[PDB]
Amino acid sequence: IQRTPKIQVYSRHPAENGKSNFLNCYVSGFHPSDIEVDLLKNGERIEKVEHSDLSFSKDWSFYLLYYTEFTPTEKDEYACRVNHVTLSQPKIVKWD
Amino acid sequence: GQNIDQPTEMTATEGAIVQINCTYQTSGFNGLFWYQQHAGEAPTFLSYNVLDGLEEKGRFSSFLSRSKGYSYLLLKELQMKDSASYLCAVKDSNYQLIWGAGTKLIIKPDIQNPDPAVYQLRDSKSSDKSVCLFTDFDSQTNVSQSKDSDVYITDKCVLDMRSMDFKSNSAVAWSNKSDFACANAFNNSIIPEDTFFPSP
Amino acid sequence: MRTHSLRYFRLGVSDPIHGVPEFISVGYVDSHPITTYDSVTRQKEPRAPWMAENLAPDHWERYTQLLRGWQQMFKVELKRLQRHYNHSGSHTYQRMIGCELLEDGSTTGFLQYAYDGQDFLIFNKDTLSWLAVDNVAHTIKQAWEANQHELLYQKNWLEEECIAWLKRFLEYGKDTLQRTEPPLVRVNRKVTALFCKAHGFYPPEIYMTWMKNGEEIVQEIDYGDILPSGDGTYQAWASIELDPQSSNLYSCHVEHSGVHMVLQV
Amino acid sequence: NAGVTQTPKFQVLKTGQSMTLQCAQDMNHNSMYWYRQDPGMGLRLIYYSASEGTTDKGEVPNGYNVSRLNKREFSLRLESAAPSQTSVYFCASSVWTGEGSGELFFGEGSRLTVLEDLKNVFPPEVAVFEPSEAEISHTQKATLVCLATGFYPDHVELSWWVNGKEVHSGVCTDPQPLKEQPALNDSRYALSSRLRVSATFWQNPRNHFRCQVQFYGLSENDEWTQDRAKPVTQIVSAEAWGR
Ligand SMILES: *Cc1c(O)ccc2ccccc12
Ligand SMILES: [Cl-]
Ligand SMILES: [Cl-]
Ligand code: NA
Structure with missing residues (x-):
């Protein structure tokens, strides 16, 4: 039994245009542990992206937090792209 | 990981029961071990306790109270072969062993027909020594060291003639002094009133 | 504790x-x-x-x-x-x-x-x-x-x-x-759903639910995960769907660290 | 099936001399240990190896080092021997470390004596004393005595041989040597043993008795400068026949 990752994208604070913030991608409930995560700005990969160490849940699945500092603007669309053995192609999840 | 205490030595009689105590003050607790170590030999595992209570293995039992920080090793129906050191050891929070200094257990044989005597052994052609044998005395008798620097006196030793199911205590004294006589060799000891001294 | x-x-x-x-x-x-x-x-x-x-x-x-x-x-x-x-x-x-x-x-x-x-x-x-x-x-x-x-x-x-x-x-x-960092809690509107959103809180353990006319409707409630915000605090939400044909008193209830709060809509 | 095998059983060293102790276990254990045992205190861990491929200090690492050569072997190295390292060393192993209730399995031990000078090393003089006729007549038993005297350090194994075969029944050997001069720190030692047999056995003229003492002393490479004979490892014996 392999478990596909749940993928949630959200800002650290309630977003307001022009105000510095952090964009989060919380990837959880997946098994086995190998996974690949990118944050996207307007479809393109963001270079300065941080992540927590691999984390362990009681139900034996895994989770990780990927994030980057950003300033939301009205025009810029952000996304999180995740690949895992349970996915036949990368899954892209848009912010908001 | 700080402190283990057990008595240095204990002496009991063949056939009886002895309780060897071990108290510990450690940083955490992951179990208490007892090991037997015969003189000149390797320690060997005897018992393990980690929850409270009494655990029995043959003639030996081991007890633990974690809240009192205390264990005992109980030996019933003591035999001569039980003469040994008994080592207490505790595993601390970091699974490091803390060892007690050991308790030496001395067993007094049950002597059925005491016949204390001091004998003069025959001189050796190749030696200037005269040799005296104090033997067959009851186990309550203690042999003290000589107080003459050129007289040597060994402590009592228990021997077992298995084919006769016969045990006996003895100690040896020797000297090369012109003085030396078996009649006086052990007079620094408290020896039985009826000790047999055969004639020269 | x-x-x-x-x-x-x-x-x-x-x-x-x-x-x-x-x-x-x-x-x-x-x-x-x-x-x-x-x-x-x-x-x-x-x-x-x-x-x-x-x-x-x-x-x-x-x-x-x-x-x-x-x-x-x-x-x-x-x-x-x-x-x-x-x-x-x-x-x-x-x-x-x-x-x-x-x-x-x-x-x-x-x-x-x-x-x-x-x-x-x-x-x-x-x-x-x-x-x-x-x-x-x-x-x-x-x-x-x-x-x-x-x-x-x-x-x-x-x-x-x-x-x-x-x-x-x-x-x-x-x-x-x-x-203890208490939650900041708000209600957003977005078939229209009411969203009750909490953020800024620690510890992560929090209970959020919707009541309708003072009665709980667990089957009709959607619960969001308690999520790390990245600064040591957490955020979470819960939603319900509004009845377009009949009015109801809806309220969001949040319990966190021995304190209860109610947001009446 | 040998368990834990360590060598050597005895060793005399001069201050500054190098020494390696060997230890192997065939129990397919993962954890190995080196301890020293001294009078008046508990075993003290020198170094240990929780698993193949790792080692770390114990409570008393200074003056020693170790090599976990492979899964089976764990050697202890004294690079520059000191008198304070005079001790009995024990190798031990366990299946794992910090997992459950697992006990230690110990080697036979290695007795090391470290001396500033080897000029106080002496083999035993060995003499055998025939039984008292008064004992024979009073008890129908006959006690032979063996005395091994003047030896240093306390590195000896005494045994009795009756008609060419080692015996243990009827034997009592002092568990501890006597210091011939209790006040001196490097006093030479004495050791006594008894062999007791029936008067009938003693009185058979063709029964042969021998007291044998193995002494562990110097080897070829040890330097010797004294006038007396070099106190090398050797066997010294004395004998008696029935009468
Ligand atoms: C890894 C570790 C540390 O550092 C402290 C305490 C522990 C307790 C149990 C298991 C591992 C531990
Ligand atoms: Cl702790
Ligand atoms: Cl663990
Ligand atoms: Na060292």
């Missing part, structure tokens, strides 16, 4: 892709990582500054040696399982041990294993036995249960040692673990 837990996990992987550790071990107090080790670094290291600051280098040196040994033992155990399952390719083996200290002063303790992410063996420290999920686990159960002493040891460790470690670390991390 509210409820706290200490949990230590191990992960073993039998045929890991390039560079990825075959073995990883991480401890947690509540949701906070406190220690880490893996087969690549071969070093035990703190994962919280209050762990680093309160434990001297000889602690890390000793657990480094312990974990190097535990790594080898995990490898041997996984090798044995994969052989008995007659499985090829890469498979995973996991362990989790730990304890909870409840608000009311009572304790729990647990020890369990998993193979390929599913329960494999589960320790019962009250009956001193292992629950096996299949016949491979059953063989291991028989072996582990053959030495009564090993079962007694785990009971002691879970009930006495684990709780003592937990209390030790709770004091080290006091300023983090025992603090």
Whole structure:
């Protein structure tokens, strides 16, 4: 039994245009542990992206937090792209 | 990981029961071990306790109270072969062993027909020594060291003639002094009133 | 004090892709990582500054040696399982041990294993036995249960040692673990749904629900996950769908750290 | 099936001399240990090896080092011997470290004596004393005595041989040597043993008795500068026949 990752994208604070913030991608409930995560700005990969160490849940699945500092603007669309053995192609999840 | 205490030595009689105590003050607790170590030999595992209570293995039992920080090793129906050191050891929070200094257990044989005597052994052609044998005395008798620097006196030793199911205590004294006589060799000891001294 | 837990996990992987550790071990107090080790670094290291600051280098040196040994033992155990399952390719083996200290002063303790992410063996420290999920686990159960002493040891460790470690670390991390940051809670409207949103709170444990005319409607409520915001605090939400044909008094109810709040819509 | 095998059983060293102790276990254990045992205290861990491929200090690492050569072998190295390292060394192993209730399995031990100078090393003089006729007549038993005297250090194994075969029944050897001069720190030693047999056995003229003492002393490479004979490892014996 392999478990596909749940993928949630959200800002650290309630977003307001022009105000510095952090964009989060919380990837959880997946098994086995190998996974690949990118944050996207307007479809393109963001270079300065941080992540927590691999984390362990009681139900034996895994989770990780990927994030980057950003300033939301009205025009810029952000996304999180995740690949895992349970996915036949990368899954892209848009912010908001 | 700080402190283990057990008595240095204990002496009991063949056939009886002895309780060897071990108290510990450690940083955490992951179990208490007892090991037997015969003189000149390797320690060997005897018992393990980690929850409270009494655990029995043959003639030996081991007890633990974690809240009192205390264990005992109980030996019933003591035999001569039980003469040994008994080592207490505790595993601390970091699974490091803390060892007690050991308790030496001395067993007094049950002597059925005491016949204390001091004998003069025959001189050796190749030696200037005269040799005296104090033997067959009851186990309550203690042999003290000589107080003459050129007289040597060994402590009592228990021997077992298995084919006769016969045990006996003895100690040896020797000297090369012109003085030396078996009649006086052990007079620094408290020896039985009826000790047999055969004639020269 | 509210409820706290200490949990230590191990992960073993039998045929890991390039560079990825075959073995990883991480401890947690509540949701906070406190220690880490893996087969690549071969070093035990703190994962919280209050762990680093309160434990001297000889602690890390000793657990480094312990974990190097535990790594080898995990490898041997996984090798044995994969052989008995007659499985090829890469498979995973996991362990989790730990304890909870409840608000009311009572304790729990647990020890369990998993193979390929599913329960494999589960320790019962009250009956001193292992629950096996299949016949491979059953063989291991028989072996582990053959030495009564090993079962007694785990009971002691879970009930006495684990709780003592937990209390030790709770004091080290006091300023983090025992603090309270209350939630900021708002209601948004967005078939239209009402969203009740909370953020900024610590500890992560929070209860959010919707009431309709003072009665709960659990089946019609959607619950969001409690999510890390990245600054040490958490955020969460809950939603319900509005009846377009009839008015109702809806209210969001939030409980966090002994305080209850109501937002009437 | 040998368990834990360590060597050597005895060794005399001069201050500054190098020494390696060997230890192997065939129990397929993962954890190995080196301890020293001294009078009046508990075993003290010198170094240990929780698993193949790793080692670390114990409580008393200074003046020693180790090599976990492979899964089976764990050697202890004294690079520059000191008198304070005079001790009995024990190798031990366990299945794992810090996992459950697992006990230690110990080697036979290695007795090391470290001396500033080897000029106080002496083999035993060995003499055998025939039984008292008064004992024979009073008890129908006959006690032979063996005395091994003047030896140093306390590195000896005494045994009795009756008609060419070693015996243990009827034997009692002092568990501890006597210091011939209790006040001196490097006093030479004495050791006594008894062999007791029936008067009938003693009185058979063709029964042969021998007391044998193995002494562990110097070897070829040890330097010797004294006028007396070099006190090398050797067997010294004395004998008696029935009468
Ligand atoms: C890894 C580790 C550290 O550092 C402290 C305490 C522990 C308790 C149990 C298991 C691992 C531990
Ligand atoms: Cl662990
Ligand atoms: Cl602790
Ligand atoms: Na050293």
